[PDB]
Amino acid sequence: IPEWEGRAPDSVDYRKKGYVTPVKNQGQCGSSWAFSSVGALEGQLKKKTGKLLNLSPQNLVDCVSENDGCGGGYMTNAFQYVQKNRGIDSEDAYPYVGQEESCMYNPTGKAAKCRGYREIPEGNEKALKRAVARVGPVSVAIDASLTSFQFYSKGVYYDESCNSDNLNHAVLAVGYGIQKGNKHWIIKNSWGENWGNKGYILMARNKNNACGIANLASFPKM
Ligand SMILES: O=C(O)C(Cc1ccccc1-c1ccccc1)C(=O)O
Numbered sequence: 001i002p003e004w005e006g007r008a009p010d011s012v013d014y015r016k017k018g019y020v021t022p023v024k025n026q027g028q029c030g031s032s033w034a035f036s037s038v039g040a041l042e043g044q045l046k047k048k049t050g051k052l053l054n055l056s057p058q059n060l061v062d063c064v065s066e067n068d069g070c071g072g073g074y075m076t077n078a079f080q081y082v083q084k085n086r087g088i089d090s091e092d093a094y095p096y097v098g099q100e101e102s103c104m105y106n107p108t109g110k111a112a113k114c115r116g117y118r119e120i121p122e123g124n125e126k127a128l129k130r131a132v133a134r135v136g137p138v139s140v141a142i143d144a145s146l147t148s149f150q151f152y153s154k155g156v157y158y159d160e161s162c163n164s165d166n167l168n169h170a171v172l173a174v175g176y177g178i179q180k181g182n183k184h185w186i187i188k189n190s191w192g193e194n195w196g197n198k199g200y201i202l203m204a205r206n207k208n209n210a211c212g213i214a215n216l217a218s219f220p221k222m
Contacts, residue, residue, distance in 0.1 A: 003134035004127065011177030012133050013186055019043045019136055020174050021054050023199030025192035027098040029070035034060035035190035036139040036170035037078035037220075041088065043136035043174075044222035045112045053111050054091035062103045069100030075117075075139040075170060079220040082114035113222065120217035123164075125206055128185075128214045129176055137174045137188070141216035142203070144169035149211070152196050156182035158204035164212035173217070176205055185213055 001007075014020050021042050026035055034057035046052045060067070064081040067073025082088045085105065093109025120138070121127050132138050143166040144150070148159045156179050175186035184202040193199045204210045 004130055008130050008133045011175070013175035013177065014043060014137050015174055015186075018052055019046045020172075020188060021052060023188060023193045024054075024057070024096070024190050026057075026190040029061070029098040029100075030068075030072055031057055031061050031070055031098075032170040032190050033067065033073035033075055033141075034058075034064075034078060036141075036172050037075045038088075038091075039172035039174075039188060040075070040137055040139045040219050041079075041082065041112050041114065041222070044220055047136055048222050055111055056089040056091045056094035056096070056109075058091075058096045058101075059089045059094045059105055062101050063105050065103075070098075074216075075141075076119065076218050079114050079117040079218070082112070082220070083116055086110075086113060088112050088114070115221040117218050117220045120214055122216075123209050123214050125209060125214045128173070128217050129205075131217070131219060132173055132176055132185075135219050137172050138217055138219045139170065140173050140185075140187075140213055141167040141170045142187075142211040142213055143167060144171075144211075149201070152201050154197055155179070156184045156202045156204055158182075158207055158210055162211040164209050164215055167212050167216050173213075174200075183207075 087110035089109035090111035
């Protein structure tokens with residue numbers, strides 16, 4: 001029963017399974033791509049080794065040379081860096097500063113490795129669902145620019161004005177399900193525990209790829 005085949009469960013929540021580290025705060029730096037990347041790596045590290053450890057977004061901000069540090073970046077590029085670098089440091093060994101600095105990677109602080117990555121077929125929410133169910137938390141990019149998104153508190157978020165072609169923010173899909181009849185994705189943000197619902201938002205699922213949720217989705221292989 002390969003990932004893209006067979007019975008995917010109705011709901012999944014990796015927070016309940018010890019796959020998800022505490023919600024972080026990226027601060028004034030535009031590094032959600034690095035927080036989304038470390039989130040997906042943290043999930044695979046837990047699955048592979050049984051240990052849950054904060055990995056270093058600053059390691060990615062400083063060292064993934066073609067990403068733009070606090071100016072944006074692609075999670076695919078972050079996974080490729082960890083593969084070619086033969087590791088990524090832990091948060092404790094390479095702590096978050098909130099601004100791009102010179103690369104200070106140290107193998108002594110290495111906490112995970114990467115064997116490559118796969119991308120979800122663009123716009124395909126069924127493939128994203130099967131990936132979350134079979135692999136673990138998946139990095140995704142969304143339009144987070146709307147006031148309705150930024151001041152979300154509860155419920156399943158849907159806004160017809162969300163622009164699936166304006167992928168301005170990277171987050172982590174840690175599960176999916178249904179709430180009062182409304183299908184959703186369970187999304188870990190990087191705006192602190194004070195944002196949304198303890199740092200999380202439920203985003204509409206199977207509603208025409210709302211906010212672009214399946215347009216730039218990927219996971220690392222480990
Ligand atoms: O197509 C989607 O995205 C799913 C549905 C689904 C996806 C993947 C594997 C199985 C199912 C499924 C179908 C019918 C009953 C129970 C489960 C959904 O609509 O939630």
